[PDB]
Amino acid sequence: SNTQTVLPFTGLNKPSGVAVDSAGTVYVTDHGNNRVVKLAATQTVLPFTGLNTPSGVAVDSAGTVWVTDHGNNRVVKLAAGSNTQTVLPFTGLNKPSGVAVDSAGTVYVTDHGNNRVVKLAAGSNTQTVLPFTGLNTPSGVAVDSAGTVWVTDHGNNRVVKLAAGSNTQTVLPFTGLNKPSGVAVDSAGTVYVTDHGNNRVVKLAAGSNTQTVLPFTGLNTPSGVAVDSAGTVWVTDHGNNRVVKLA
């Protein structure tokens, strides 16, 4: 589509990240109000407590929600319907900026202050550090079925990926990025990036050597992106306190 729609969230303040689950429920981290809200396919506020500028959210097939609680250097999780949040046994995080979960329940976090990406396997209590190199203030992460990890390397204006069990980081052929802030990948392998400083969302179609600019209009400093099964793209339009979607 070429016409966006604005999602009917209310009272957002600098939304920072967005996730969509298999039933089309949209979750948003409302950075300026220290909360996470959700809209089923009238918003609901999830029962997190003591969040400090939440920066990213991910949701798995069971409906468990994970949030990077940036100002408290931690990752918190709510199981579906649960009333108590759990702090995950990550250690050493500094200003965590984003989170993604794969089909296996493995949790990946961009550890922005430490220029690294860390992961916690499902059923594991000990994190591992991924062998990215040269990151600077990584801002977002996405993971696909293959277990390939994509990261927006915000401080170097680039997007990098790491294949599963590999020592090989690939720089994706995006062009002219300015503080890329979020990344999403769809089942076809298409990669979508929010280009924060250029007020645009770009996309590298699977197989393509050059990026395409999605037809959003009016964005201001977009901060995060999620894609669903049907290729609908959701973007947190941070500067306008709103969330937009494009079919």
Side-chain angles (χ1 to χ4, degrees), residues 1-82 84-244 246-247:
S1 144
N2 158 299
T3 206
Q4 60 196 38
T5 57
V6 180
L7 264 63
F9 287 110
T10 52
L12 298 176
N13 173 9
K14 296 199 245 182
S16 58
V18 58
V20 190
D21 74 3
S22 56
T25 302
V26 179
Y27 302 77
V28 174
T29 46
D30 192 11
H31 173 271
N33 291 318
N34 285 340
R35 69 192 184 151
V36 180
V37 300
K38 71 178 159 142
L39 263 173
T42 51
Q43 76 201 20
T44 285
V45 175
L46 282 63
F48 292 107
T49 61
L51 297 185
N52 180 359
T53 56
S55 61
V57 57
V59 60
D60 74 3
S61 36
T64 297
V65 179
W66 290 261
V67 172
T68 38
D69 187 11
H70 170 267
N72 292 315
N73 297 333
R74 61 178 188 177
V75 181
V76 288
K77 134 174 101 153
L78 265 177
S82 169
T84 296
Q85 65 195 24
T86 295
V87 181
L88 275 66
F90 287 107
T91 56
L93 300 178
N94 186 259
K95 302 310 217 203
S97 56
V99 59
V101 56
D102 71 24
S103 37
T106 299
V107 174
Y108 302 78
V109 175
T110 41
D111 195 12
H112 160 284
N114 296 321
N115 292 321
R116 69 185 179 170
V117 177
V118 301
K119 100 159 92 153
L120 199 67
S124 169
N125 281 345
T126 311
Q127 85 199 16
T128 68
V129 178
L130 280 68
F132 289 95
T133 184
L135 298 185
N136 183 270
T137 57
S139 58
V141 57
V143 187
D144 70 356
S145 155
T148 299
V149 180
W150 287 261
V151 172
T152 36
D153 193 3
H154 165 273
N156 294 318
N157 292 338
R158 64 185 186 160
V159 180
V160 297
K161 75 167 154 186
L162 187 74
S166 131
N167 217 32
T168 300
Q169 166 172 300
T170 292
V171 181
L172 282 73
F174 289 101
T175 301
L177 301 186
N178 184 348
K179 303 304 101 194
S181 54
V183 56
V185 63
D186 68 18
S187 41
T190 294
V191 180
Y192 309 75
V193 172
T194 45
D195 195 3
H196 166 282
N198 287 325
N199 299 319
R200 68 185 179 165
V201 178
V202 301
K203 151 186 139 142
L204 203 48
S208 181
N209 286 340
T210 198
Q211 72 198 18
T212 50
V213 179
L214 303 195
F216 286 107
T217 62
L219 300 186
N220 190 293
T221 55
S223 57
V225 54
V227 297
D228 78 5
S229 46
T232 304
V233 177
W234 286 268
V235 168
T236 39
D237 190 13
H238 173 279
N240 294 319
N241 290 333
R242 80 174 166 169
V243 179
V244 302
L246 197 75

PDB file of all heavy atoms in Angstrom, residues 186-207:
ATOM      1  N   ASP A 186      11.393 -10.123   7.482  1.00  0.00           N
ATOM      2  CA  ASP A 186      10.216 -10.944   7.232  1.00  0.00           C
ATOM      3  C   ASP A 186      10.632 -12.336   6.775  1.00  0.00           C
ATOM      4  O   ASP A 186      11.810 -12.657   6.625  1.00  0.00           O
ATOM      5  CB  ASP A 186       9.270 -10.278   6.230  1.00  0.00           C
ATOM      6  CG  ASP A 186       9.831 -10.191   4.812  1.00  0.00           C
ATOM      7  OD1 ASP A 186      10.792 -10.921   4.479  1.00  0.00           O
ATOM      8  OD2 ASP A 186       9.277  -9.369   4.017  1.00  0.00           O
ATOM      9  N   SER A 187       9.638 -13.194   6.557  1.00  0.00           N
ATOM     10  CA  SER A 187       9.969 -14.577   6.230  1.00  0.00           C
ATOM     11  C   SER A 187      10.707 -14.684   4.904  1.00  0.00           C
ATOM     12  O   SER A 187      11.464 -15.637   4.698  1.00  0.00           O
ATOM     13  CB  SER A 187       8.709 -15.439   6.165  1.00  0.00           C
ATOM     14  OG  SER A 187       7.672 -14.728   5.523  1.00  0.00           O
ATOM     15  N   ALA A 188      10.478 -13.758   3.978  1.00  0.00           N
ATOM     16  CA  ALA A 188      11.213 -13.829   2.714  1.00  0.00           C
ATOM     17  C   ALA A 188      12.677 -13.374   2.845  1.00  0.00           C
ATOM     18  O   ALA A 188      13.478 -13.571   1.925  1.00  0.00           O
ATOM     19  CB  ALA A 188      10.464 -13.004   1.645  1.00  0.00           C
ATOM     20  N   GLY A 189      13.084 -12.797   3.969  1.00  0.00           N
ATOM     21  CA  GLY A 189      14.442 -12.300   4.079  1.00  0.00           C
ATOM     22  C   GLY A 189      14.557 -10.816   3.782  1.00  0.00           C
ATOM     23  O   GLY A 189      15.658 -10.279   3.812  1.00  0.00           O
ATOM     24  N   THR A 190      13.450 -10.136   3.519  1.00  0.00           N
ATOM     25  CA  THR A 190      13.481  -8.697   3.355  1.00  0.00           C
ATOM     26  C   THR A 190      13.807  -8.020   4.679  1.00  0.00           C
ATOM     27  O   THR A 190      13.314  -8.424   5.734  1.00  0.00           O
ATOM     28  CB  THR A 190      12.128  -8.228   2.808  1.00  0.00           C
ATOM     29  OG1 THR A 190      12.039  -8.780   1.487  1.00  0.00           O
ATOM     30  CG2 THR A 190      12.089  -6.694   2.743  1.00  0.00           C
ATOM     31  N   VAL A 191      14.657  -6.994   4.625  1.00  0.00           N
ATOM     32  CA  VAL A 191      15.126  -6.321   5.816  1.00  0.00           C
ATOM     33  C   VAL A 191      14.619  -4.899   5.762  1.00  0.00           C
ATOM     34  O   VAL A 191      14.764  -4.226   4.725  1.00  0.00           O
ATOM     35  CB  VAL A 191      16.658  -6.338   5.927  1.00  0.00           C
ATOM     36  CG1 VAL A 191      17.142  -5.603   7.216  1.00  0.00           C
ATOM     37  CG2 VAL A 191      17.135  -7.756   5.982  1.00  0.00           C
ATOM     38  N   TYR A 192      13.975  -4.475   6.832  1.00  0.00           N
ATOM     39  CA  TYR A 192      13.416  -3.121   6.955  1.00  0.00           C
ATOM     40  C   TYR A 192      14.172  -2.377   8.048  1.00  0.00           C
ATOM     41  O   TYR A 192      14.366  -2.917   9.149  1.00  0.00           O
ATOM     42  CB  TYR A 192      11.920  -3.144   7.341  1.00  0.00           C
ATOM     43  CG  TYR A 192      11.047  -4.042   6.468  1.00  0.00           C
ATOM     44  CD1 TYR A 192      11.076  -5.455   6.610  1.00  0.00           C
ATOM     45  CD2 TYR A 192      10.175  -3.491   5.547  1.00  0.00           C
ATOM     46  CE1 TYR A 192      10.310  -6.289   5.816  1.00  0.00           C
ATOM     47  CE2 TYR A 192       9.394  -4.299   4.797  1.00  0.00           C
ATOM     48  CZ  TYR A 192       9.466  -5.686   4.939  1.00  0.00           C
ATOM     49  OH  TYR A 192       8.695  -6.455   4.163  1.00  0.00           O
ATOM     50  N   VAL A 193      14.553  -1.141   7.783  1.00  0.00           N
ATOM     51  CA  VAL A 193      15.285  -0.352   8.771  1.00  0.00           C
ATOM     52  C   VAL A 193      14.664   1.029   8.921  1.00  0.00           C
ATOM     53  O   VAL A 193      14.408   1.696   7.913  1.00  0.00           O
ATOM     54  CB  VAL A 193      16.778  -0.223   8.357  1.00  0.00           C
ATOM     55  CG1 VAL A 193      17.543   0.763   9.276  1.00  0.00           C
ATOM     56  CG2 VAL A 193      17.491  -1.609   8.334  1.00  0.00           C
ATOM     57  N   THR A 194      14.504   1.510  10.167  1.00  0.00           N
ATOM     58  CA  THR A 194      14.081   2.899  10.390  1.00  0.00           C
ATOM     59  C   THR A 194      15.325   3.780  10.391  1.00  0.00           C
ATOM     60  O   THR A 194      16.256   3.592  11.192  1.00  0.00           O
ATOM     61  CB  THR A 194      13.291   3.045  11.676  1.00  0.00           C
ATOM     62  OG1 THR A 194      13.951   2.323  12.738  1.00  0.00           O
ATOM     63  CG2 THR A 194      11.896   2.456  11.453  1.00  0.00           C
ATOM     64  N   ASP A 195      15.330   4.753   9.499  1.00  0.00           N
ATOM     65  CA  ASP A 195      16.450   5.662   9.251  1.00  0.00           C
ATOM     66  C   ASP A 195      16.201   6.965   9.996  1.00  0.00           C
ATOM     67  O   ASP A 195      15.744   7.949   9.423  1.00  0.00           O
ATOM     68  CB  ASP A 195      16.592   5.918   7.746  1.00  0.00           C
ATOM     69  CG  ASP A 195      17.932   6.545   7.407  1.00  0.00           C
ATOM     70  OD1 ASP A 195      18.732   6.698   8.348  1.00  0.00           O
ATOM     71  OD2 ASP A 195      18.165   6.930   6.236  1.00  0.00           O
ATOM     72  N   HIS A 196      16.483   6.936  11.305  1.00  0.00           N
ATOM     73  CA  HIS A 196      15.978   7.923  12.263  1.00  0.00           C
ATOM     74  C   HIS A 196      16.259   9.344  11.789  1.00  0.00           C
ATOM     75  O   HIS A 196      15.355  10.183  11.712  1.00  0.00           O
ATOM     76  CB  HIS A 196      16.642   7.621  13.617  1.00  0.00           C
ATOM     77  CG  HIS A 196      16.510   8.698  14.641  1.00  0.00           C
ATOM     78  ND1 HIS A 196      17.277   9.843  14.630  1.00  0.00           N
ATOM     79  CD2 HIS A 196      15.749   8.764  15.757  1.00  0.00           C
ATOM     80  CE1 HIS A 196      16.964  10.585  15.683  1.00  0.00           C
ATOM     81  NE2 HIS A 196      16.052   9.943  16.391  1.00  0.00           N
ATOM     82  N   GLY A 197      17.502   9.605  11.391  1.00  0.00           N
ATOM     83  CA  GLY A 197      17.898  10.956  11.038  1.00  0.00           C
ATOM     84  C   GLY A 197      17.434  11.425   9.690  1.00  0.00           C
ATOM     85  O   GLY A 197      17.501  12.628   9.407  1.00  0.00           O
ATOM     86  N   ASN A 198      16.933  10.510   8.855  1.00  0.00           N
ATOM     87  CA  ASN A 198      16.385  10.874   7.563  1.00  0.00           C
ATOM     88  C   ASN A 198      14.866  10.787   7.524  1.00  0.00           C
ATOM     89  O   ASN A 198      14.276  10.943   6.454  1.00  0.00           O
ATOM     90  CB  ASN A 198      17.030   9.992   6.502  1.00  0.00           C
ATOM     91  CG  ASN A 198      18.473  10.388   6.246  1.00  0.00           C
ATOM     92  OD1 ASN A 198      18.832  11.574   6.293  1.00  0.00           O
ATOM     93  ND2 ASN A 198      19.309   9.406   6.000  1.00  0.00           N
ATOM     94  N   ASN A 199      14.219  10.578   8.669  1.00  0.00           N
ATOM     95  CA  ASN A 199      12.755  10.510   8.745  1.00  0.00           C
ATOM     96  C   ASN A 199      12.150   9.594   7.673  1.00  0.00           C
ATOM     97  O   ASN A 199      11.185   9.929   6.985  1.00  0.00           O
ATOM     98  CB  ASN A 199      12.132  11.915   8.677  1.00  0.00           C
ATOM     99  CG  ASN A 199      12.594  12.800   9.832  1.00  0.00           C
ATOM    100  OD1 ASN A 199      12.692  12.344  10.965  1.00  0.00           O
ATOM    101  ND2 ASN A 199      12.749  14.093   9.570  1.00  0.00           N
ATOM    102  N   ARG A 200      12.698   8.400   7.551  1.00  0.00           N
ATOM    103  CA  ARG A 200      12.207   7.517   6.517  1.00  0.00           C
ATOM    104  C   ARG A 200      12.435   6.087   6.960  1.00  0.00           C
ATOM    105  O   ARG A 200      13.208   5.801   7.908  1.00  0.00           O
ATOM    106  CB  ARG A 200      12.928   7.781   5.169  1.00  0.00           C
ATOM    107  CG  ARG A 200      14.408   7.371   5.233  1.00  0.00           C
ATOM    108  CD  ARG A 200      15.130   7.756   3.923  1.00  0.00           C
ATOM    109  NE  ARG A 200      16.537   7.342   4.078  1.00  0.00           N
ATOM    110  CZ  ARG A 200      17.412   7.244   3.091  1.00  0.00           C
ATOM    111  NH1 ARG A 200      17.079   7.527   1.848  1.00  0.00           N
ATOM    112  NH2 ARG A 200      18.654   6.836   3.365  1.00  0.00           N
ATOM    113  N   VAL A 201      11.759   5.173   6.269  1.00  0.00           N
ATOM    114  CA  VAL A 201      11.980   3.740   6.491  1.00  0.00           C
ATOM    115  C   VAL A 201      12.465   3.157   5.169  1.00  0.00           C
ATOM    116  O   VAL A 201      11.831   3.364   4.126  1.00  0.00           O
ATOM    117  CB  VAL A 201      10.703   3.037   6.978  1.00  0.00           C
ATOM    118  CG1 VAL A 201      10.921   1.537   7.170  1.00  0.00           C
ATOM    119  CG2 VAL A 201      10.161   3.741   8.242  1.00  0.00           C
ATOM    120  N   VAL A 202      13.573   2.430   5.208  1.00  0.00           N
ATOM    121  CA  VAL A 202      14.096   1.853   3.984  1.00  0.00           C
ATOM    122  C   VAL A 202      14.034   0.344   4.093  1.00  0.00           C
ATOM    123  O   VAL A 202      13.866  -0.219   5.176  1.00  0.00           O
ATOM    124  CB  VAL A 202      15.515   2.350   3.690  1.00  0.00           C
ATOM    125  CG1 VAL A 202      15.481   3.913   3.556  1.00  0.00           C
ATOM    126  CG2 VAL A 202      16.469   1.895   4.825  1.00  0.00           C
ATOM    127  N   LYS A 203      14.221  -0.318   2.948  1.00  0.00           N
ATOM    128  CA  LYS A 203      13.986  -1.752   2.881  1.00  0.00           C
ATOM    129  C   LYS A 203      14.960  -2.346   1.888  1.00  0.00           C
ATOM    130  O   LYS A 203      15.219  -1.737   0.868  1.00  0.00           O
ATOM    131  CB  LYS A 203      12.528  -1.987   2.537  1.00  0.00           C
ATOM    132  CG  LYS A 203      12.135  -3.170   1.822  1.00  0.00           C
ATOM    133  CD  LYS A 203      10.655  -2.988   1.544  1.00  0.00           C
ATOM    134  CE  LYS A 203      10.243  -3.401   0.264  1.00  0.00           C
ATOM    135  NZ  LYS A 203       8.909  -4.062   0.187  1.00  0.00           N
ATOM    136  N   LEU A 204      15.561  -3.469   2.210  1.00  0.00           N
ATOM    137  CA  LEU A 204      16.365  -4.175   1.211  1.00  0.00           C
ATOM    138  C   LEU A 204      15.592  -5.446   0.909  1.00  0.00           C
ATOM    139  O   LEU A 204      15.582  -6.395   1.708  1.00  0.00           O
ATOM    140  CB  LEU A 204      17.773  -4.465   1.710  1.00  0.00           C
ATOM    141  CG  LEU A 204      18.916  -4.689   0.783  1.00  0.00           C
ATOM    142  CD1 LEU A 204      19.053  -3.667  -0.325  1.00  0.00           C
ATOM    143  CD2 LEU A 204      20.135  -4.614   1.723  1.00  0.00           C
ATOM    144  N   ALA A 205      14.886  -5.429  -0.222  1.00  0.00           N
ATOM    145  CA  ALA A 205      14.114  -6.585  -0.617  1.00  0.00           C
ATOM    146  C   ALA A 205      15.053  -7.781  -0.716  1.00  0.00           C
ATOM    147  O   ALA A 205      16.248  -7.631  -1.021  1.00  0.00           O
ATOM    148  CB  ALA A 205      13.403  -6.277  -1.946  1.00  0.00           C
ATOM    149  N   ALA A 206      14.562  -8.962  -0.349  1.00  0.00           N
ATOM    150  CA  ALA A 206      15.395 -10.159  -0.486  1.00  0.00           C
ATOM    151  C   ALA A 206      15.954 -10.254  -1.907  1.00  0.00           C
ATOM    152  O   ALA A 206      15.217 -10.087  -2.878  1.00  0.00           O
ATOM    153  CB  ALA A 206      14.565 -11.406  -0.147  1.00  0.00           C
ATOM    154  N   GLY A 207      17.275 -10.512  -2.036  1.00  0.00           N
ATOM    155  CA  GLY A 207      17.885 -10.614  -3.364  1.00  0.00           C
ATOM    156  C   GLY A 207      18.346  -9.303  -3.982  1.00  0.00           C
ATOM    157  O   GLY A 207      18.984  -9.329  -5.042  1.00  0.00           O
TER     158      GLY A 207
END
